[PDB]
Design a protein around this nucleic acid. Sequence first.
RNA 1: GUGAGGUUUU
RNA 2: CCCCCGCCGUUAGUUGCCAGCGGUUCGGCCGGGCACUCUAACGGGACUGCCCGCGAAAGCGGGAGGAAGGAGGGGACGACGUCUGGUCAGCAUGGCCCUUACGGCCUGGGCGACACACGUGCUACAAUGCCCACUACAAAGCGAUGCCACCCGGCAACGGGGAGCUAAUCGCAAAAAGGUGGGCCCAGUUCGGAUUGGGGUCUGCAACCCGACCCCAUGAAGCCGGAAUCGCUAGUAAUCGCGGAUCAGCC
Lengths: 155, 118, 127, 60, 98, 24, 87
Amino acid sequence: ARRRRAEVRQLQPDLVYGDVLVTAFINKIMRDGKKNLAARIFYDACKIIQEKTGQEPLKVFKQAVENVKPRMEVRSRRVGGANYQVPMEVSPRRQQSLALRWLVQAANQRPERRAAVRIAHELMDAAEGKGGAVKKKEDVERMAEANRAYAHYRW
Amino acid sequence: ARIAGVEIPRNKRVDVALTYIYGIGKARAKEALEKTGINPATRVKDLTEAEVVRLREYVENTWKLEGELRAEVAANIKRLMDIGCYRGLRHRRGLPVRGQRTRTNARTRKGPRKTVAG
Amino acid sequence: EQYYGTGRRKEAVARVFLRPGNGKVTVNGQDFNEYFQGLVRAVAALEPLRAVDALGHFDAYITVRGGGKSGQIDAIKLGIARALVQYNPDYRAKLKPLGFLTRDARVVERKKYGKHKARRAPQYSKR
Amino acid sequence: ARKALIEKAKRTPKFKVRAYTRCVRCGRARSVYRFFGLCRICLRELAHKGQLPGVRKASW
Amino acid sequence: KIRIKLRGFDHKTLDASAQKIVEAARRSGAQVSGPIPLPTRVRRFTVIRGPFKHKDSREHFELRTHNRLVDIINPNRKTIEQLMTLDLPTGVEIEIKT
Amino acid sequence: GKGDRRTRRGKIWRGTYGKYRPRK
Amino acid sequence: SLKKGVFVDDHLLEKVLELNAKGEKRLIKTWSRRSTIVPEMVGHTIAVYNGKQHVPVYITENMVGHKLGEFAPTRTYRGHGKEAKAT
RNA sequence: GUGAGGUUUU
RNA sequence: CCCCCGCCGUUAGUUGCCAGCGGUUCGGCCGGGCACUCUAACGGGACUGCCCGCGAAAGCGGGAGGAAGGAGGGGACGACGUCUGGUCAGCAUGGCCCUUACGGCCUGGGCGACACACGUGCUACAAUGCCCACUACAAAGCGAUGCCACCCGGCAACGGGGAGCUAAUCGCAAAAAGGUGGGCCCAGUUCGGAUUGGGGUCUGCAACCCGACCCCAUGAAGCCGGAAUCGCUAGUAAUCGCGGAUCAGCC
Ligand SMILES: [Mg+2]
Ligand SMILES: [Mg+2]
Ligand SMILES: [Mg+2]
Ligand SMILES: [Mg+2]
Ligand SMILES: [Mg+2]
Ligand SMILES: [Mg+2]
Ligand SMILES: [Mg+2]
Ligand SMILES: [Mg+2]
Ligand SMILES: [Mg+2]
Ligand SMILES: [Mg+2]
Ligand SMILES: [Zn+2]
């Protein structure tokens, strides 16, 4: 079953600048357990996280908190005739985690030759606040609280 | 930036564009430049325009001309069947000839999923 | 300099060496950015010292032997925390309010039968 | 054969392929050891009578 | 002083020499210290239990090499005698080094 | 790569070092 | 990957070379191919177990350092097909 | 106040 | 009740650290320590035990607190029984035939034959990967006809020695991204890759078709896949890194 509270999945108190919120996003950027190649993008790169955004090297994501998180989407449906289980009264932890796993591939899937552009393909989207999670909150997250037909099937 | 060979990889590093010239590889494009003094991290386009033309005779001294040893790929198969050996029809039936398995893996010289009826 | 602190992750034989001096943090023959160079978790080591307004007047070099690299940093976060016996372990108002008093015991789990790499196994076939 | 496969291999041993690294009492030649001589099957029905101490069950 | 390769079967029966030469050599001249531990060389033979119809899930089989050495601080005619005139030949195969 | 003819670890996976990349 | 010692089997090293003493018929029965074919006599026919049965081999002066190991017909592969798949 | 295109016997 | 793990006064002080202060080649090196350090020996070692709420009844939220917590952690462990499931490709045993033989006798071939078709291991779709200066942070089994630093001949695959070891230093091995690196510039491209016929070294009767594949030739396929699968709950995936076991390479 599932009737049990979770674990010590809250990682660790880190030491660089605090900021356990985006160190987990570095854990989303990295693959194959590789360190000192993903943390060089966020920390050791001194020319792409600054000199282009205008200010504020560490807290670029001020714009990438207020209006970028995907929150509200369907869980899972079987043959389940016409439920449309969008609204759901969703959770802030899932709201953060869908951003942390859905704001990743706007730099990996979008390549560029330069070793200073393919990294911080994402930092301009975080500083400006654009990408694939801005139109999605207007497409998917604005079709639940306006009118009246879907289904009584909830849980 | 013209090369010693024929197919130009369009202005890359001297370890890269000079390599896949026929007759040249990793251990010839790596030692053929450190003797002449070119730093292997530089570009073919950023070479000296005299090093463009004087690094061409060094390649064409000993080994046989481009396409001729590629014809010796088909001619060595001819000379091994001096009496019409069994290795000749090991070659000319579309399969690897070392002795790999050919129902699974080593699907290369066979046509990929070409012919079965059932 | 020789203290009670023995922080053993990664089967690292920990011998931590510190006394009141002048420098912030030292290591065996290097200067904290050449031997510890390579992991970002080594840019700020002395968390039990800097957390209690006792930042940088300790020598804090080591003789630690076993395993890899970041368990030495865990032997600073836990090795200094066991090595504060000079700074009076009856001081119970320096490590208690912060979320600090969980000890490093998370070791990598061992390997079993029918198995490649410690709970990775071949799957079902149904034929 | 079943009985005299031991005496079949006791001719002059030639060289370092087709090794006669066989089990002693039965007719096995698989998973023998340079500390036992017996095989993985005969350590089960011989060393678990108490006949061959040393090797035990660890199970940690 | 001298190295003596102590190999016992079980560590209690190896303590029947490592705890008998020592307590038989402390009291009358040419004293002795306790045994330092050599590494127990636990072998690994993790092989299949069943003869034929047993594919995976095999049992661990070890082989424990219990070994120490006792450091005497003076050898003489009343302590080399205590190495070879007392014996409990049930868990002991020792050697004497030079 | 492991399965390559000559890489850094292609000598490790296949057993011996190369005639251009020796031991020392 | 051949070396300075070109090995022929001691069972079959000089018991193929009976021709070079006087001169006899153009056949002699050797067995192996992992042993090197004899370089002393040339031009004649050497009987050998060629993989399937004892059928001879005949050189035509084209071997300088070529290996005889490509002479083994025993897989009489007629062609493709005849599978009866999905089993 | 609510649920199935829906199955065959080895 | 049987151990790993985090874990100590006592710990043996052949791992021994100038940690005091010692002197040194500036490795505790060396002619006393054991104060700080394992292997392996070991007995103490918290228990929702105390408090306040839910309760006639232990289930009882949380606090103190330590090595950890209310089950300290994984692990070690496998009921009465099922499948007339399978084992003579162990052993003994009933039984069919074979004992001038489905036995041995002698060394080439075969299990790696090819056009397929399902899942199991290595596993690149590139600047986040990569032949590339480089030397390290080593958990444990290995190794005296074996490992083989240094010292070699080395474009070397590897001849011939010796250094240390009848077996924790001496040497295994290289721990891997640690590189503060120069670059490979959106590329079907040094990201990536096999089949290939000639030469040079073999440990080995001998490597072909059944040596590792060693610099060489040469590099076909691949930009993340369909009807929804399937190993994974916080030290769990994932590349990376080490040894055996019959062991000469290693398939
Ligand atoms: Mg090309
Ligand atoms: Mg791990
Ligand atoms: Mg039915
Ligand atoms: Mg003490
Ligand atoms: Mg439990
Ligand atoms: Mg069955
Ligand atoms: Mg079944
Ligand atoms: Mg059956
Ligand atoms: Mg293509
Ligand atoms: Mg191996
Ligand atoms: Zn047996």
